[PDB]
């Protein structure tokens, strides 16, 4: 099966380095030009670098020139991105992508993409959230998932038994360098006395699992 | 360097209707232009390349046209998963690079719906830690444009709130918005009335929700 799978993402302090890998399967890797493309959270796509099929030339976006190096090992079907002197503005999902052209140095389009891997550059350290209730013919209630790093968190209600009327918002990045998000649910006002509401928060980077009962 | 400009930033359409997305280049790129689709939370995928060539496996409902600086992506009959972000893309030579447009998002057009507003005080558990977060929820409204203003003891707040908006709901085509006002516990305890004032096309007059305490 034709695919690209990135690895090596994570958190990094400003000025430090990280090396991403991308394992290619299902096609003659040594016959294609390869790229890295990134997407900062909530922003558009930005091309990062390209390497010719035989590795004999490379080009970079001015934003990463001198700090990043794209390379490949055709014997292992693997593409790399060495990222040095990282800055907060390099925080993004990084995708490896195949160039459409076959054995052609002219690079133009991305015909196959990986799944992406998140790289977060910040002075903050990995930390699980604190979960606070948002206490309540429609009533609204929720949970405030505050002060975690890095993204993402997942939230469910009543262990997945409550899905209708749930809204889990995108997180915001606070001036402290930690994220905060809310998750809410609207229910009939009469259900406040008959049904129990618990928010279930997971933050995989810190192995945090929280169950918070939200009472009127 | 080429610049690609996509218009409109948001296209409001109905399912089944024809979508026409535009991409303008700053200077000619001949027919060397591609379109990508990005569904929320997923990687982009190539739809069209060389202005009008459909990529392998892409359904016939997607078609591209144009040359020089004026390009169009047409989606003949929209499916639910097509209400996504679309990017155009080309090559630049000075300096060598790949340029993307800023994207056009497709949303489902529906009737105007005013938000239902709710305010939440900070929990006693959070106050025990030295900070107070007050949250305001604007639920299930349309269109996406909405304004939240925080007022504490009748004074307009500035610089101490952050907000975010959900993706358009798949069932009712509305948006929701959450705004958080952050104060120190000491500052929260110095004030009594906390209010969030909401303005939106569906409200003839701003709606305020408030509570007393702190």
| CA A188 vs CA A36, A57, B76, B173, B200: distances in Å | 48, 63, 40, 21, 24
Among A43, A109, A142, A215, pick the best mutation site for testing chain B contact (most B Cβ within 10 A): A109
Please give the tally of structural domains in chain A.
Answer: 2
Q: How many other CB atoms are found less than 10 A from the CB of residue B15? A: 13
- Chain B CB contacts of A110 below 8 Å: 34, 36, 44, 46, 89
The 8-class DSSP code of residue B114 comes to P
**A205: containing domain:** 130-213
Based on the fold, state whether residues A18 and A108 are members of the same structural domain: yes
- Collapsing DSSP to helix, strand or coil, A8 comes out as coil
* The token pair that represents B207 in the structure block: 């709606």
Based on the fold, state whether residues A112 and A46 are members of the same structural domain: yes
Q: How far apart are CA B3 and CA A45, in angstroms?
A: 14
Based on the fold, state whether residues A167 and A108 are members of the same structural domain: no
CA A193, A194, A195 angle in degrees (round to 5)? 105
Residue B86: which of B36, B12, B19, B146 has the closest Cα?
A: B36
Q: How far apart are CA B112 and CA B203, in angstroms?
A: 10
Whether residues B125 and A133 touch (CB distance < 8 A) is answered with yes
Q: Which of A46, A108, A133 sits opposite B91 (nearest CB)?
A: A108
| CA B150 vs CA B126, B160, B193: distances in Å | 20, 9, 11
Based on the fold, state whether residues A115 and A17 are members of the same structural domain: yes
Q: How far apart are CA B26 and CA B20, in angstroms?
A: 20
Based on the fold, state whether residues A87 and A193 are members of the same structural domain: no
Strands of chain B, DSSP E:
4-7, 10-13, 19-25, 34-38, 45-49, 53-54, 62-67, 70-75, 85-93, 96-100, 104-108, 116-120, 131-141, 147-152, 155-156, 161-165, 175-184, 193-199, 207-212
Which run of H or E residues covers position A185? strand A179-188
Can the peptide bond before residue B192 be classed as cis, meaning omega within 30 degrees of 0? no
Give the burial class of A177: count Cβ atoms within 10 A of its Cβ; 0-12 exposed, 13-18 middle, 19 or more buried: middle
Any chain A CB within 8 A of the CB of B165?
A: yes
Q: What residue ranges define each of the domains in chain B, with the CATH number in brackets? A: 4-108 (2.60.40.10), 116-212 (2.60.40.10)
Give A43-89 as a DSSP string.
S-EEEEEEE-TTSS-EEE-TTTTTTEEEEEETTTTEEEEEE-S--GG
Q: How far apart are CA A179 and CA A126, in angstroms?
A: 11
Residue B162: which of A20, A183, A171, A208 has the closest Cα?
A: A171
Tell which B residues from 39 to 68 touch A, by Cβ distance under 8 Å.
Answer: 43-46, 49, 55-56
């Amino acid at each position: 099966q034709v695919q690209l799978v990135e690895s090596g993402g994570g958190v990094v302090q400003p000025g430090r380095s990280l090396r991403l890998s991308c394992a290619a399967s299902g096609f003659t890797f040594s016959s294609y030009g390869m790229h890295w493309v990134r997407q900062a959270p909530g922003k558009g796509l930005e091309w990062v670098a390209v390497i010719w099929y035989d590795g004999t030339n490379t080009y970079y976006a001015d934003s990463v020139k001198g700090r990043f190096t794209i390379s490949r090992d055709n014997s292992k079907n693997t593409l790399y991105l060495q990222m040095n002197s990282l800055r907060a503005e390099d925080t993004a999902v990084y995708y490896c992508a195949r160039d459409l052209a076959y054995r052609d140095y002219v690079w133009r389009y991305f015909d196959l993409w990986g799944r992406g891997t998140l790289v977060t550059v910040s002075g903050a350290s990995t930390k699980g959230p604190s979960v606070f209730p948002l206490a309540p013919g429609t009533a609204a209630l929720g949970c405030l998932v505050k002060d975690y790093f890095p993204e993402p968190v997942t939230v469910s209600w009543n262990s997945g038994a409550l899905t209708s009327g749930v809204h889990t918002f995108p997180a915001v990045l606070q001036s402290s360098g930690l994220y905060s998000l809310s998750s809410v649910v609207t229910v009939p006002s009469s259900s406040l006395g008959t049904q129990t509401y618990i928010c279930n928060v997971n933050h995989k980077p810190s192995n945090t699992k929280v169950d918070k009962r939200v009472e009127p | 360097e080429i610049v690609l400009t996509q218009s409109p930033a948001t296209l409001s359409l109905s399912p089944g209707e024809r979508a026409t997305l535009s991409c303008r280049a700053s200077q000619s790129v001949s027919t060397y232009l591609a379109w990508y689709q990005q569904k929320f939370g997923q990687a982009p995928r190539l739809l069209i390349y060389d202005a009008s060539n459909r990529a392998t496996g892409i359904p016939a409902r997607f078609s591209g046209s144009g040359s020089g600086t004026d390009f169009t992506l047409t989606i003949s009959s929209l499916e639910p998963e097509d209400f996504a972000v679309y990017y155009c893309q080309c090559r630049s030579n000075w300096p060598p690079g790949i340029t993307f447009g800023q994207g056009t998002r497709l949303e489902i057009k529906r009737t105007v719906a005013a938000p239902s507003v709710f305010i939440f005080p900070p929990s006693d558990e959070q106050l025990k830690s030295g900070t107070a977060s007050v949250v305001c929820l604007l639920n299930n409204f349309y269109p996406r444009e909405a304004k939240v203003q925080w007022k504490v003891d009748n004074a307009l707040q500035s610089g101490n709130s952050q907000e975010s908006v959900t993706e358009q709901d798949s069932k009712d085509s509305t948006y929701s918005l959450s705004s958080t006002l952050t104060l120190s516990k000491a500052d929260y305890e110095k004030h009594k009335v906390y209010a969030c004032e909401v303005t939106h096309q569906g409200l003839s007059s701003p709606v305020t929700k408030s509570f007393n305490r702190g």
